C-alpha cells in the first residue's frame, strides 16, 4: 500500500491474509491478501497461486491488524481447497480471481464480530460514475522499492479511471481487458495512493446504496503509486455467476 495510513482491522473487517508454507523450511510466509465473501469462502487473485501450492500449504487469517502479530478476536483457518479461474492468463493477468474455501467441522467457518464480517457482493448491473473514490486495504510493501513488506494493515483511497483512460495504450502497451478495472490517485504534494507488492487478492470497496460493496480485486499495475499511471483491478461484477455457480 502506497500512501494512506495504517488501519485497524475493524475498519476493514473483510480483509484477510494468506500464508504458504516454506517448501523447504518450516513455517509460513506471506503470500497474498484476501476478501471474506462467505463464512467459508473468500475471494483472491488467481496469479497468487501460479506456483501450485497444495491447499494444506495455505492458511488464511481473518480479523488481524498486524501482519504476523496475532489479534484478540482473530480467527485462523486452514484452506481445504481453492478454485482458480479456468481460463486464467498467467501472462496478461486477465481473469485474475481465485475462490478459496475454509475448512471446518460443521459447514461454518467464520462468525460475525467487530473485526470479522463478510463483504457485500456487487450487483451485475453496477456501473459507478467515473472518478468515484473507493478505499483499498492490504499488508503489502509501502513503495515499489521498499525492502520488506508492511508490518500492519494500511488503507488508502483511489478514484475510478474511466474506460477511455483505462486502455492498453495508457498502460505501456500491456493488455487490458473488460474484465479489468482501473483506479489510481488523481492529485496534482506527492505520495499518491495505490496498491503495491503484497496486496493482490485484496479488496476495492465502494459505497453503493449506502452499502460498502466489493467492486474490484487487487490484480496488478505498473506501480507502485505512479502519477497518471493507474492500478489495474479485477472487475468483480463480471464473475458473480462464477462465484455463485461454484462454492457448492
Amino acid at each position: 500500500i502506497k500512501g494512506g495510513l495504517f488501519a485497524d482491522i475493524a475498519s476493514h473487517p473483510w480483509q484477510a491474509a494468506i500464508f504458504a508454507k516454506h517448501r523447504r523450511s518450516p513455517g509460513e510466509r506471506f503470500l497474498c491478501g484476501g476478501i471474506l465473501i462467505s463464512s467459508c469462502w473468500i475471494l483472491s487473485a488467481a496469479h497468487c497461486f501460479q506456483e501450485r501450492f497444495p491447499p494444506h500449504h495455505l492458511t488464511v487469517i481473518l480479523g488481524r491488524t498486524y501482519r504476523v502479530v496475532p489479534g484478540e478476536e482473530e480467527q485462523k483457518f486452514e484452506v481445504e481447497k481453492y478454485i482458480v479461474h479456468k481460463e486464467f492468463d498467467d501472462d496478461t493477468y486477465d481473469n485474475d480471481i481465485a475462490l478459496l474455501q475454509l475448512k471446518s467441522d460443521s459447514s461454518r467457518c467464520a462468525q460475525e464480530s467487530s473485526v470479522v464480517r463478510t463483504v457485500a457482493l456487487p450487483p451485475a448491473d453496477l456501473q459507478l460514475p467515473d472518478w468515484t473514490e473507493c478505499e483499498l486495504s492490504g499488508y503489502g510493501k509501502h513503495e515499489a522499492l521498499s525492502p520488506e513488506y508492511s508490518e500492519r494493515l494500511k488503507e488508502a483511497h483511489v478514484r475510478l479511471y474511466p474506460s477511455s483512460r483505462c486502455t492498453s495504450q495508457h498502460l505501456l502497451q500491456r493488455t487490458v481487458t473488460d474484465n479489468m478495472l482501473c483506479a489510481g490517485d488523481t492529485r496534482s504534494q506527492a505520495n499518491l495512493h495505490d496498491a503495491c507488492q503484497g496486496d493482490a487478492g485484496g479488496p476495492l470497496v465502494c459505497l453503493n446504496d449506502g452499502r460498502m460493496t466489493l467492486v474490484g480485486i487487487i490484480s496488478w499495475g505498473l506501480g507502485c503509486g505512479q502519477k497518471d499511471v493507474p492500478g489495474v483491478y479485477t472487475k468483480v461484477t463480471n464473475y458473480l455467476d462464477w462465484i455463485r455457480d461454484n462454492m457448492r
Binding site: 523447504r24 503470500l31 496469479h47 505501456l172 490484480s219 499495475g221
Partner: protein, 372 residues
C-alpha cells in the same frame, strides 16, 4: 558438436585447480579460453608433451571432425550483439626454422594464424602483445601484469583473454539497486550494492552427494542465446569449495533440465571482477610438467631447430555485471507489474556464476564471487 561438451569439460578442470588455490578470491575464468588455446598448442606438440595434454583434454585435433569444430564455435559464437571477445595468441621469435608442411597445417584447421613478434626488443614486445590484446578485447583489457617476466631468453608464450558484458531478456531496474549487507566467507559483512527484479525465473534445487542443498537460477540474455547461472547453498557455512570441487559439464546440462519457471523475487549483488591466472601451476597440476622444463618441450610437430620451451602461460578475464550498460531504466522492464508477494531468493552468500552458450552447451565463463 561432440567438441562443445568435451572442450568445456577440459576448461572446468582448469578451474578446479584455480579455485582451490585462490581459496577465497574474486575469480573469473573462461573454460572456452583455456580450451581454444590448448588445442592450438596441441598441433605443435609431440611425444609425451602431446600426450600430456591430449590425455588431459580427451581427444585429438588432427583426427577428422574435431579440427573444424573449433572454427564453427569461433564462427557461431561470433551469438553476438557486441558482448564477447574471443581471441587466441601464440607469440614466438622471428626467423626460426619451421617444418616444411606445418604453417599450412596450422592456418587450415583453426581459421587463425601464428603471431610473429620479437623478443630481443623486450620494450616493443610488451607493446605489440598488449596492443594485440587492446584491439582484440574491445579496449577493455589493455595493460598486462605478466609481460614483465619477458626477457631475451623467453622464446614461447601463450595468451588468451575475453571481455564479457550482457543484455537481459528482463533487465534489472537501475532504480531498485539498493545498498545491502553481503556476507563474506571469513565472516565480514560488506556494504555492497545489489540489484533486484521480480519476474519469473528458471529455478531448481539440486543437492550435493554430501547433503548440501543449492539454489540454482538462470538469467537469460538477448535472443535467449547466452545465459548465466547462479548457484549458492541454502545456509552460509557451506563453502563454495563444496560446489566448486564437483563441477562438470553434464552437471550444468542437468541443472537446465530440472528447472521450472517460478515467480520469484531475486536480489543479486552487482560486481565487476578481473583475474589474471598463472596457468603454469594448474596445468602442471593436471599432468603437463613436460611443457615447462627450460629445455624439455617435445614440440617436434612445430620446432625442427631445438631447443624450445613454453615459458609463461596466463589468462586474463574481466567480467562486469550490471544492467546492459548505460541503457538505463528504459521503460520496458518496470519493477513490479504484478501485485503479488513472491518468494524471495537473496544472494547474500558467496556464490559461483557460470556462463553457457545454450544452443551449443559451450561453457564460456565461470568463477567465484567472494566479495564485489
Amino acid at each position: 558438436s561432440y567438441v562443445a561438451h568435451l572442450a568445456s569439460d577440459f576448461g572446468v578442470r582448469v578451474f578446479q585447480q584455480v579455485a582451490q588455490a585462490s581459496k577465497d578470491r574474486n575469480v573469473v575464468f573462461s573454460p572456452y579460453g583455456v580450451a581454444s588455446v590448448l588445442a592450438m598448442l596441441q598441433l605443435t606438440t609431440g611425444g609425451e608433451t602431446q600426450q600430456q595434454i591430449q590425455a588431459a583434454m580427451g581427444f585429438k585435433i588432427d583426427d577428422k571432425g574435431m579440427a573444424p569444430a573449433l572454427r564453427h564455435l569461433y564462427k557461431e559464437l561470433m551469438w553476438n550483439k557486441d558482448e564477447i571477445s574471443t581471441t587466441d595468441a601464440i607469440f614466438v621469435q622471428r626467423d626460426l626454422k619451421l617444418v616444411q608442411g606445418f604453417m599450412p597445417h596450422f592456418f587450415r584447421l583453426f581459421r587463425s594464424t601464428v603471431k610473429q613478434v620479437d623478443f630481443s626488443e623486450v620494450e616493443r614486445a610488451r607493446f605489440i602483445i598488449n596492443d594485440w590484446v587492446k584491439t582484440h578485447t574491445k579496449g577493455m583489457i589493455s595493460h598486462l601484469l605478466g609481460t614483465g617476466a619477458v626477457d631475451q631468453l623467453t622464446r614461447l608464450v601463450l595468451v588468451n583473454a575475453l571481455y564479457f558484458n550482457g543484455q537481459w531478456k528482463t533487465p534489472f531496474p537501475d532504480s531498485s539497486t539498493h545498498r545491502r549487507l553481503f556476507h563474506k566467507s571469513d565472516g565480514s559483512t560488506v556494504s555492497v550494492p545489489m540489484m533486484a527484479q521480480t519476474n519469473k525465473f528458471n529455478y531448481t534445487e539440486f543437492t550435493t552427494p554430501d547433503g548440501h542443498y543449492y539454489d540454482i537460477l538462470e538469467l537469460p540474455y538477448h535472443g535467449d542465446t547466452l545465459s548465466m547461472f547462479i548457484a549458492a547453498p541454502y545456509e552460509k557455512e557451506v563453502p563454495l569449495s563444496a560446489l566448486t570441487n564437483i563441477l562438470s559439464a553434464q552437471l550444468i546440462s542437468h541443472w537446465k533440465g530440472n528447472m521450472t519457471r517460478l515467480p520469484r523475487l531475486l536480489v543479486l549483488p552487482k560486481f565487476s571482477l578481473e583475474t589474471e591466472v598463472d596457468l603454469r601451476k594448474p596445468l602442471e597440476n593436471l599432468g603437463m610438467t613436460d611443457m615447462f622444463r627450460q629445455f624439455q618441450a617435445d614440440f617436434t610437430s612445430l620446432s625442427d631447430q631445438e631447443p624450445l620451451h613454453v615459458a609463461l602461460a596466463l589468462q586474463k578475464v574481466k567480467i562486469e555485471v550490471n544492467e546492459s550498460g548505460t541503457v538505463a531504466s528504459s521503460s520496458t522492464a518496470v519493477i513490479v507489474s504484478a501485485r503479488m508477494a513472491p518468494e524471495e531468493i537473496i544472494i547474500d552468500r558467496p556464490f559461483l556464476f557460470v556462463v553457457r552458450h545454450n544452443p551449443t552447451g559451450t561453457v564460456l565463463f565461470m568463477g567465484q564471487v567472494m566479495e564485489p
